[PDB]
Amino acid sequence: SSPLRRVLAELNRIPSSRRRAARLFEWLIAPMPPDHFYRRLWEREAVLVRRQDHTYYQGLFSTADLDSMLRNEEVQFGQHLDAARYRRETLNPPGRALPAAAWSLYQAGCSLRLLCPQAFSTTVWQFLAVLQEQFGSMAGSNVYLTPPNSQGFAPHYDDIEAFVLQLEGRKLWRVYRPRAPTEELALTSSPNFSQDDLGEPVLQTVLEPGDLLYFPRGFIHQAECQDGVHSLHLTLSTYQRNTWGDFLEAILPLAVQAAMEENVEFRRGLPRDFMDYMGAQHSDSKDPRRTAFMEKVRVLVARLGHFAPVDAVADQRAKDFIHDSLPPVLTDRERALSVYGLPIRWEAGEPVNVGAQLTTETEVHMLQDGIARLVGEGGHLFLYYTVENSRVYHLEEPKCLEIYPQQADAMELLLGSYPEFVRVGDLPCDSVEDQLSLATTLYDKGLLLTKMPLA
C-alpha cells in the first residue's frame, strides 16, 4: 500500500472525470482544503505542505524508474534528458542517453533532468492527465535528480506556476517574494541571479520525501544539497500564458474589426493634419487638437468592450487547450463501457462479435468530461477532442470531426449533461437516423460510452 496507490484505486471508482480531477488535487495538497488554497494562496503565496509521510508519493516516479527508462526506452540527450553541473555548464553529449553515459555524468557531479516523464511513465501520465482537467491549463512535469554534495543552480524565477513534490532524499529550498512590482506574476523567465541580487527568503526548508512546495511565477527560488544524500523531485508546471492579458491579446484585433464593420464612428477618416501635433516630436505641445485627439482615442478604446467577441475567443482557447492536453486515462468501467473494451477481436482465423450496434434504446454519455469541445469556425461546427493526442506535447496536429446542423443540439446536449445517461432516442434531432448517426460517430471515435456494453 501507499497513499498514492490508494487515491488511484479511489479515482478508478469515481464515475465523474470532473470529480476525480478535484479529488486528485485535494490529495496533492492534503490536508489543506483546495478552496482555501485557490482563494488565498494560488498566485499569491509560496506554500509548504509538511507531509510527515515519506511514503506519500511512492509509486509516482523513482530513480529506479529513470534507470529502467534509460535502458528500455529511446531517451535522447537534449530532447529528453539534460545533464548539468554548476556558472551553469551543460554536459550533453549528443545522442542516446544510455545508463552508462548518464550514470557516469551523475558520478561526476552532474544533475539529471528528465524533460518529459509522462511520455515514459504511465503513472506520471495519469497524474498530469487528471490534474490538467481542474487547472483548465496544460500541466507539464520535469523530474530532477541531484547527486550528493553538488552545487545548486543559480537563483531564478519562472513564468509558470510550480509545485515541487519531493520524491527521494532531501533538499534545502529557499523561495523569495517577487522583489519589485514588475516581477509579480512575471511574464517571462528571469536571468540567473547573484546572491547579492536577493533579499531574505519568505520560505526556507529542507524538503523531505512526501513534502510539497508551491510558488507562483515570479517567485525566485534556489535549492541546495543536504546531509550528504541525493535528491529526486518531480516538478509540476501549469498556467503558461493563461493570463487576462493573453485573453485580451486575442480579443482586441477582433473587437476593432467588429467595431469598424458595425459602427460608422470607427470608419471616420483621421484628421488631415494630425501629423502636425501627434508624434514624439510633439510630446509636450500645448496644442488643444492634441488633447482632443487623445480623448477620442480613449473614448473609442473604451467603447471597444461592447464589441469584444468573448465567447468566440473562449472557444479558441478551449481548442488550444484540447490540442495541448494529454490523452485521457480511462477507468476500468469507462474502458469496459466504450469502443475500447468492446470484445471485437480476431479469434481462430476470424473476427468475433462484429455487428454490435447502438439502437434508440442504448443509454449514452460522453466518455469523460474534458475530452471534447464544440467550436464554430467560418460557418461550420467542429468537435475537437483529445482522445487521439500523443503523450508527447504537440506530437499530433489538432483533431476534430464535423458536426452537422441537424445534430448540433444533440451534441451540446451530450456535452452539457455529463455524466447523466440519455437515451439515443431522446436526443433532440429531427430524425431517428440523425440520433443513431451522431451516437455511432461519437462512440466509434471513442468519445462516448454506453450504460451497458453493446450486444
Add this chain to the structure above:
Amino acid sequence: SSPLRRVLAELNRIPSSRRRAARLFEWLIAPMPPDHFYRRLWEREAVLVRRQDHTYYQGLFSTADLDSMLRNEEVQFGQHLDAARYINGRRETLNPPGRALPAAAWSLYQAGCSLRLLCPQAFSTTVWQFLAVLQEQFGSMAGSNVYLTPPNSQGFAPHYDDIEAFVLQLEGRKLWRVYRPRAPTEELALTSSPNFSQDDLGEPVLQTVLEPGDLLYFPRGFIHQAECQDGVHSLHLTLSTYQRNTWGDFLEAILPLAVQAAMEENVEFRRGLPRDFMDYMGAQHSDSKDPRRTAFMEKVRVLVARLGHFAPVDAVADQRAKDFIHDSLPPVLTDRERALSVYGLPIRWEAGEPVNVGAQLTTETEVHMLQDGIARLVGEGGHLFLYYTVENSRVYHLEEPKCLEIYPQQADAMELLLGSYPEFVRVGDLPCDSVEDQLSLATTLYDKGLLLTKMPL
C-alpha cells in the same frame, strides 16, 4: 493661358509648400471654400461644382497626351492600361496581354471599350505635380486614374469604392449618377463593393451631365455610375485619397501595443484566468444564467477600458507618418527651390573637364528644409532616423523606405530644422555642441536634397 496654367505659375511663386498645397486645393474646388467643404461635405455629401469654364483644366491631361504616351512609353495592358466595356448590365475585360500599342488601344476604343490609365502620374509631369502638391494637404496618398470612354457607351457597372473620389471632367461629357450609402454599414465603406445591378439601387442623390471644367466629389460608400450620351466621348481624371485612413485603422495599430504595455506595467493584466471559465464562456454557453459569466464579461470591459492609459498614440502617429512618406510622390520643386538646392548646382562637365566644382556650406550659410512635407523623424529601438521622400519613384512603392540615421548630437538641430520651416536659420546658430556637428548635419541634409540655402552656393 488656362486657369490650370495660371495657378501652377502662381504656385511657382509661393515660397511655402504647405501654403501652396492649400492654394491648389482651394483652386481645385473653386468657388467653394475649403473650410466649408471640410467641415460639412467631406466624408458626408456628394458635391457638384459647376465650373462655368470649359477651359479650367486645360493642360493637366488630354487624349492627345494619352495617345503619345501609348506610342512613346512602355505602356502595358493590365499593369498600366485597362480596356473594359459594360454591355447590357455585364462587365467584361478585354486586355490583350503585353504592350499596349496605339493600334491595339485605338482599335479597342472603336469596338466600344473604355480605356483606363492606372498611373497617369508616372507618364505626365503635370498630373505628378498636381498629386504631389495635393497629397501634402490630405496627409494621405493621392492617386489618380484616367478614364477614356467612347461615344454611346458605359465602361463600368455601378459600384462604390473605398476611397474619397474627386472626378475632374476633362473632355466631352458624361451623365453621372451618384447614390447615398443605401444602408448604415455601407456608409464610409471599408472595402470596394461588388458590381451591382440597377435593381439594387434606389434614386440617385445626384444626377448630372458633367462638362469640361466640372468637379464631382463623393465619399467612399457612395455608389456611382456614368454614361456617355449625345454622340460625344468623355475623358476624366479621378483623384483618390484616404485609403484606410480611419480612426479604426489607428486603433488597429495601437491596441496590440497597448495590451503588451498594460501587461508589462500592471499586474491586473498578468493575473491568471479562472481555472474553469470554459464551463460558462464559449458559444455553447451564451444562454447561461451563470453569474460567473456576468462577472467575466465585466472584467473584460473594465480591462479593455483601461487600455486607453497604455495606448502609445505618438509612436503609432510616427509609424503612420513613415508609411505616408513611403507612399508619397516625390516633391515638385519650384524654380527657386531648384536654384537654391543641390539640384540646381552648376557643377557640370564642359570641354573635357568638370567646371564650377567650388562651393561648400559654412557656419555663415543660411538654411531651411527644402519643403515641408518631404521628411519625418522617427525613433526606432534606441536609434533615430529621418525618413524622406525625395528619392521616391512616381510609381507607387517601386522604391523601398529611404532614410538616414540621425545621431544624438544632431537630434535637436534636426527637430529645429523640421519645426521652423520655412524660416532660414544660420548653420552656426544650429543647436549642436560642435562646429563640426552643425556643419556635418547641414552637408548631409543638403547633399541628400533635403535642404536649401538662402543664396546659391
Add this chain to the structure above:
Amino acid sequence: GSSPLRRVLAELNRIPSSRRRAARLFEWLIAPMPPDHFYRRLWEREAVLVRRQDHTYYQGLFSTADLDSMLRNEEVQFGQHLDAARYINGRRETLNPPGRALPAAAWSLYQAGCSLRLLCPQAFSTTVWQFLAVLQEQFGSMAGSNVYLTPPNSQGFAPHYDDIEAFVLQLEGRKLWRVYRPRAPTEELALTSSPNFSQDDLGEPVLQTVLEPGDLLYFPRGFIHQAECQDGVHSLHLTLSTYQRNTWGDFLEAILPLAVQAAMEENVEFRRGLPRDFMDYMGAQHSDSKDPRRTAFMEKVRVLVARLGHFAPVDAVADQRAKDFIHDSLPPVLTDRERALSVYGLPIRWEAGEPVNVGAQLTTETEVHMLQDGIARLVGEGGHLFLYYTVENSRVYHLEEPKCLEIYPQQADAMELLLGSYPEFVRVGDLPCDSVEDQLSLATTLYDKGLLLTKMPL
C-alpha cells in the same frame, strides 16, 4: 514453441559475424535453392516459386493475432499505417475512416469485404524488424515490408507491377497468384509503379499458383501480378521489398553532374566556347537539317560525353550511396553476445540509492572490433571525415536525421582498419595511431556510441 523460423533465429544468435548471419538468413528464406544460383540466374530476371511443403516454416514471424494486438495496444492510424481497400468487379475502393484504426473498426471493415494492409509492420513487430534488419545487410539496399490480410471470397488489389523486387511470404490461408513477364521492353525492370490494369490488356501468366503457408513467391520489378482469395479461406502474407532506385542509371545520375564540373575545371576542351551560330542548325526545327555543322556538333557532343568517364568521382559517389543506405537502415539487432560485450550490456545500474559497477574503462590491452559489419561508414565531405552510423536509427523510416561523428586525420587510419578488419579483434595499443591518447580516445568514443565491442566485458 519450435518452428524452422525460431530454429534459424536461434542459430543466428550463435553466428559471431553479422555478414555471415545475413547470408545465412537469406539462405533460409529461399531454402533449398542456393543463393548463388538465385542471384546469378533468377534475381532481376525470373519469377520464382518456392513450394515449401511446410506450413510451419514462418511461424513466429507475424500473424493475424499479432495484428489484432498491435491495433489494440499501439497507435495505428488509418492512411499512415493501415489501409482498408476492396477490389470489386475491376475497380479500386479505399475505405479508410480518418484517425485511429481500432480493432472494432478494422474487423468490421474486414467482415464487410475489405483487405487490410499494414505499411510498416517492422515499427510494431520485433521479429519483422529483426528479419528485415539482417536481410538489409546482404541486399546492400533497404528492406521494407507490408503485411496483407484478405477476407474469404475476395481480391484486395487490381493487377499492376511495382518498382521494387518482391518476396512474398505466405503466412496464413491460401491465395491464387498470377504473375506475368514484362509485357514490353520498356516495362522490363521498370522504374516506376504501373497504373492499375484491366485483365484485357494482360497476356498469359508465366507463373500461376495457389500459395500455401510457408511458400515464397519472388518476382522482379516490372512483372505484373494479381492475387485471388478462394475456397472460403482468408489470406495473410508479408511482402519483403528491396532495390528501390538502386540502379546503374541512379548511380550515373549522381556521378555525371560532378564529372562535367570536374572536366570543366581540369580540361580546357570543356571550357571552349560554343559556336556563335549553333542555334541556326541545332534545335527541334532543324532535326532534318543537312548542314554538316549539325553533324560535327553532334559528333562533338558524343566525343566529349565519352571523355567524362575519366572524370567520374566513382568512389565519392559510392560513399554518398552508403551514407544514404546507413540513413535508410533499420537499427541493428544485437546477439546475446554482442549486447554483453558492448556499452549496452555493462552492468551499471541504480541500486539502493546509488549507481553500482561505475567506471571500468578501456586500456591499451583491451581487444576490440566493430559491433557489427553493417552499422557504420566513413565518409569524407568538404575536406572533413565523418562516421555515419545506424545504431540510433528508428524502426520508422527516416524518422531520425542522418547521424554521424567526426573523425580527425590523426584517427582516420585506425578507423579504416576497424571497418576493414571485422570481426578480427585488434588490441587498442595496436591501432595505427600517432599517440597513445589518440588510440584510447578513438576506442572510447566508438565504444561509448555503441559502435564497438570488447573481447571480454569491461
Add this chain to the structure above:
Amino acid sequence: SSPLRRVLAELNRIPSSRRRAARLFEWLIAPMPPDHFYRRLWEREAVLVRRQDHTYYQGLFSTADLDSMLRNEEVQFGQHLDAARYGRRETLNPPGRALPAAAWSLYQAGCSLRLLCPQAFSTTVWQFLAVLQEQFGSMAGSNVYLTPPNSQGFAPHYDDIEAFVLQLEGRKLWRVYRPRAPTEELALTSSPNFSQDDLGEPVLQTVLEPGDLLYFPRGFIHQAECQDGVHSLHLTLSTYQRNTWGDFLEAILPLAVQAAMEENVEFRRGLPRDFMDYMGAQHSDSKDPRRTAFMEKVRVLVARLGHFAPVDAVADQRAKDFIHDSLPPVLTDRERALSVYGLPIRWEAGEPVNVGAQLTTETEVHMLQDGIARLVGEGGHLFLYYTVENSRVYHLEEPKCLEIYPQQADAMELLLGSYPEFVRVGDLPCDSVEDQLSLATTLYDKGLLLTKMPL
C-alpha cells in the same frame, strides 16, 4: 559625321538583321577580317587594332552623355554607377541617387566612375549592343569607365567573359598577359587581384588612343594605368558569359541519363549487392578485380549516354535563355514603316483616325527581324519566345512567349526559316484560311511580323 554615324546610317539600309549584325562587327574590328579573327584570334589571342582615327567612335558615347544622364535620368549609386579608387579597390558610393554634384565631386577627388548599364540610357549604345548580340549568339553587355587624370589604376586580374575595349576619350596604357597556368586558360570564374610580382612580361602592351580597339579572351590578365596627365573614357563590350561546351553538357547529361534509363534496360539493372565492399574512398587501393570491372562498366555506360543526349531540346533551351537575355531590337526606318509600330492610327480632333486595315490572304509577310523569336517545345506544347517586349534593363521583364497551336506549327517554322523572303499569307502551310490569317494577324499584332507594303 564620323565613321560610327556612317556605319549606323548604312545599317538603316541593310534589309537583313543578320547581315547588319555581320556588317557592324566587321566595322568594329576594321581593318581586321572577321573570318581571320574568329578562326584564329577569338578565344586564343589578345588583339590590338590601332585605328588611326580619333573620330572612329564619335556618336557612341561621351563624357558629355554621362553628364546629361546624371541630370536627366534617375541614376543610382551601386545599381547604375560605381565610384572607386585604388590596395585594394575602395568603393566610395554614397547610397542612393547619383546627382551631378555628387558624381563630379567624387571624380575630382580622384575616383573613377563606372556606369554599369549604359544601354539603358543611351540609345546608340543600345543599338550597338542589340545588333552585336545577333552575331555572337550570346548576350552583349557593356560598361563605361571614366578615369580622372593621374589616378592609380586597378589591380591586375582576369575575367570570365570575352572583352573588347573601345577607347573613347583620352589615353590609357594597357598591359595584357597570356593565362599563366593551364587552369587559367579560358577561366570559368573571375580571378582575385594579383600583384606585379605574380606576373611576367605582357604579351601585349600599348597606349590606347580614341578610336583604338583592344580584345582579349577570358583568362587573360589585364591592367591599365593613367597616361599623359589626361583623363580617360572607354567602353567595354562583354559576351560569352557561361557559353561553353561544358555548360551545354551540364544541361544535356541529367536528361541523357534519364532518357537512357527509360529507353535501355542496361541502365535499369540493379547495382551489385556488395559494391560498397570495394568501392568508396576506403577502397581506392583495393586489389579486388570487382573494382576494375565496376569502373569499366561506368565508363562503358557513360560512353553510351551520348546516343541518348537531347541535343536539340537543350539547344532550344539555351535559345530561349538567349531570347530572355537579349536587348529589344532596334528597327530600321523601313522595318518600322512596314509593321504594327508604324501604323498611322492616331487620335486627332476627338477621334481615332486611320483605323484598322486588315491582313488578307494577299498580304505578303516575313518576320520583323531574324533574331527576335524562337519556337520552343515545352510539355507537349509549342511556344514562340520573343524579344520585342524585353527591357533595355537586363531581366527587368520575365520570358515572353505566345502559344502556337499544332495547326499553325508548319507555317511558323516556315516563317522563321525563310527570313527575309516575303510570303503570301494564303501560301502559309495551314489546313484552313482562318488558321493562315489567324497566325499572321497574331504575329503582326505582337510586333513580330512585317508586311511587304504598309496596311
